[PDB]
Design a protein around this ligand. Structure first.
Ligand SMILES: *[C@@H]1O[C@H](CO)[C@@H](O)[C@H](O)[C@H]1NC(C)=O
Ligand SMILES: *[C@@H]1O[C@H](CO)[C@@H](O)[C@H](O)[C@H]1NC(C)=O
Ligand SMILES: *[C@@H]1O[C@H](CO)[C@@H](O)[C@H](O)[C@H]1NC(C)=O
Lengths: 49, 49, 24, 45, 85
């Protein structure tokens, strides 16, 4: 089920044969890659140094 | 005036019920057949329309 | 056409029809 | 034949003027779908 | 700041993943968040240089496979539903 789209179509219908037409095998998702946080920058370091 | 069709919509539980969490996907395994039936019904509605 | 007149942001996609308006 | 042709042309112009003055059957089939979709998004909150 | 790319962020009120496209509408001075007809976050204000950016999900549609049938061919065609490509 994770080698070929033909194999995915075969194993998503529980049948070893396939006929003419289109088939919905799975879904397509774009995973996030980078996590960024943005916050106010005027919060300077306190002068305890 | 006689309508013959309308908008075709496809809704899946992996994008509607669950967002970007893995626990929801694990808990949806007990209700996977329900979502499969709903997706098949929506696909049949789209094909009929 | 002019007389008769997000939702897809939560995975509720819309499938375009097989026959376009020009074909109809 | 000329009278019937003129009557047909006047009827076509009459329905053209009346249609430009709204649709009920074609508007509901989109309005209920929009309401159902809006309820679907609103159920998430 | 990274724009026009599918990234995750935490803009003080939400954790949403999507691109940040440059907008064309200006917000009011006391508006920090955005909203649309539905209850989905679509606009937000950058606290760095008071910039307005849009929100757009990247996961659109699914995967469709076209098969010529049995005893005819062996290769298939892969179709994505509603994503830019
Ligand atoms: C409304 O906003 C546009 C840009 O978004 C701006 O050009 C216009 O001046 C604004 N109108 C008023 C009355 O402030
Ligand atoms: C962030 O720092 C820069 C450089 O000091 C400054 O120009 C900018 O106004 C700051 N952003 C704020 C205060 O929102
Ligand atoms: C898809 O993105 C490319 C650039 O990445 C752009 O040139 C093209 O216009 C986009 N297509 C659509 C339909 O938005």
């Amino acid at each position: 089920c994770a080698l070929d789209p033909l194999s995915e179509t075969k194993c998503t219908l529980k049948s070893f044969t396939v006929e003419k037409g289109i088939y919905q095998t799975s879904n397509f998702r774009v995973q996030p890659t980078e996590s960024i946080v943005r916050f106010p920058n005027i919060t300077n370091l306190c002068p305890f140094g | 005036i006689l309508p013959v069709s309308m908008t075709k919509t496809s809704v899946d539980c992996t994008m509607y019920i669950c967002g970007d969490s893995t626990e929801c996907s694990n808990l949806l395994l007990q209700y996977g057949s329900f979502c499969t039936q709903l997706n098949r019904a929506l696909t049949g509605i789209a094909v009929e329309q | 056409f002019n007389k008769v007149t997000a939702q897809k942001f939560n995975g509720l996609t819309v499938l375009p029809p097989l026959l376009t308006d020009e074909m109809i | 034949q000329k009278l019937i042709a003129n009557q047909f042309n006047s009827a076509i112009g009459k329905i053209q003027d009346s249609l430009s003055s709204a649709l009920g059957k074609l508007q509901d089939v989109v309005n209920q779908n929009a309401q159902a979709l809006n309820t679907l998004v609103k159920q998430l909150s | 700041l990274v724009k026009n790319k599918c990234v995750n962020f935490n803009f003080n009120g939400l954790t949403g993943t999507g691109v940040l496209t440059e907008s064309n509408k200006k917000f009011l001075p006391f508006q920090q968040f955005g909203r649309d007809i539905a209850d989905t976050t679509d606009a937000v204000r950058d606290p760095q240089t008071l910039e307005i950016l849009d929100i757009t999900p990247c996961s659109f549609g699914g995967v469709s496979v076209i098969t010529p049938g049995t005893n005819t061919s062996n290769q298939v065609a892969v179709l994505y539903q509603d994503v830019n490509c």
